[PDB]
Structure formats: structure tokens, C-alpha cells
Amino acid sequence: LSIVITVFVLNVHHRSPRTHTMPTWVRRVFLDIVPRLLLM
């Protein structure tokens, strides 16, 4: 299950907005979840 999680993480690392579309909701939850886990 760690190899399935790290192939999903390595897929989501190398994206770019020329070939993808940013989620219309991902900004709120991920800039919400960076100070819950003490990171910037």
C-alpha cells in the first residue's frame, strides 16, 4: 500500500497547468491543512 501511495504522489508531483487543470477546491483545503500540521 506504500508503493500505491508513492506512485500517486509521484504522479501528482510532476503536473503542470499547461497539461492539467488545478482543482477549484484544492487551494482552500491544502492552505487550510498546512498550519494544522505546523508547516508555514
Partner: protein, 226 residues
């Protein structure tokens, strides 16, 4: 061994006389089921049923024997835990290689190591079973079919990784690829819309096409069990 490791084995026993024949001694049975109340239990093989009967040959007439049948059954736990679970945990990583991005530099490690772990499991399953060439088990058919699926993924992965790393000065490539491969994709259900970033969007179409038809046969051929 076809339904390994859930099978129902059958082993017989002949008792025949040795220097005499049918017109001299005559073997009569006494009880149709042989006695089983001095049995210590056996651990792995439980005994289902155990009859015994007298055979005599109607055109030879110098032949009596008494044959017993043992119908034994596996208890399937230990071989499931050691050879069905790591087999399935290896062979679920066949379809994984198309969900890598090509830019990471880590495709060939994954698909080459999946092929070598699969052929190691094929040789150890073939060291357990006998070398009777009449029949194959269902584990060996399934492992050979997923190994030919993995080397087909080797060939289309190196063709994808050659398609990805092209350049504007070397590869020109003509209208056909633009006309087909920017029209194919919303019938493949993407959501998208200057040559060096054009080639990587050619490469992220074709493996997404090949992820569709390799999750196709992995649920199509695995109802070749039924």
C-alpha cells in the same frame, strides 16, 4: 493438481495375493468401510471417506484383489497464506507502470522488477507440484498470463518513453499526429486544449489510452476463472 491448493486427492491401495490365485485362496471382505477409531488425527490432511471393495476379473479368472480408496482433502490455510497472498500482492503491480509520469526516470525499474519477481514465483510453484505433464494448475496458467502481460507493458513503455523525449529540431513528425492526437483525447475523456511542450502531451495521452485497455483485460481474463 488443477485445484491447487483446495483439491480432493484420491489414493488407492491394492491387496493381492502373491504366489497363489483365484482357484486356490479367496479374499473375502468383512466391513465395507475400513476401521478408523484408532486414528490419531493428521494435522494437514483430514479424511473425508474411506471405502473398500473386492475386484475380480471376468475374462481372466486368475485374479482377486481387494482395493481400498482413500479420499483425502487439503486443509487450505497455510498454502493460501504463503503462496496466494504474496502472489496477488506482487501481481497487482502490473497495471501501475502507466500511472507513472515519464519524466521521473523510474519506469524501467518497476516493470523489470515485477517481471523478475513473477518468474521467481513461477519456478517455486513448479518446484512444489509433480512433473506430470498431463495437467497444469490454475496458479501456473494465471502467472504465465500475467507475465506475458508484463512484457507487453515493457514494449509499450519503451515506445512511450521514446515518444516523450523528442525535440523541435530533430523530430518534425507531420499534421496526422496533431490532427489525430489532439482530437482523440476528449473521446478518451480528458479536459485540456510550443513544440517542446507539445510532445509531452502526446506522451500523456497514449499511456492513458493504455491504462484503459490494460485494466480492461485484467478484469476480463480474471473471469476466465469462471
Amino acid at each position: 493438481v488443477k485445484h491447487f491448493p483446495f483439491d480432493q486427492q484420491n489414493c488407492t491401495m491394492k491387496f493381492r495375493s502373491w504366489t497363489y490365485d483365484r482357484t486356490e485362496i479367496d479374499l473375502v471382505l468383512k466391513s465395507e468401510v475400513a476401521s478408523l477409531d484408532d486414528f490419531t488425527p493428521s494435522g494437514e490432511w483430514d479424511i473425508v471417506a474411506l471405502p473398500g471393495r473386492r475386484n475380480e476379473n471376468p475374462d481372466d479368472s486368475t485374479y482377486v484383489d481387494i482395493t481400498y480408496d482413500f479420499i483425502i482433502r487439503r486443509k487450505p490455510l497455510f498454502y493460501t497464506i504463503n503462496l496466494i497472498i504474496p502472489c496477488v500482492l506482487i501481481t497487482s503491480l502490473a497495471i501501475l507502470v502507466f500511472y507513472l509520469p515519464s519524466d521521473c526516470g523510474e519506469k524501467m525499474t518497476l516493470c523489470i522488477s515485477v517481471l523478475l519477481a513473477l518468474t521467481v514465483f513461477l519456478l517455486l510453484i513448479s518446484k512444489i507440484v509433480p512433473p506430470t505433464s498431463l495437467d497444469v494448475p490454475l496458479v501456473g496458467k494465471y502467472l504465465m498470463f500475467t507475465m506475458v502481460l508484463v512484457t507487453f507493458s515493457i514494449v509499450t513503455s519503451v515506445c512511450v518513453l521514446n515518444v516523450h523525449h523528442r525535440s523541435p529540431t530533430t523530430h518534425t513528425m507531420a499534421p496526422w499526429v496533431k490532427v489525430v492526437f489532439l482530437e482523440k483525447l476528449p473521446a478518451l475523456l480528458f479536459m485540456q486544449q510550443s513544440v517542446s511542450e507539445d510532445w509531452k502531451y502526446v506522451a500523456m495521452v497514449i499511456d492513458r489510452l493504455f491504462l484503459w485497455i490494460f485494466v480492461f483485460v485484467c478484469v476480463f481474463g480474471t473471469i476466465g476463472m469462471f
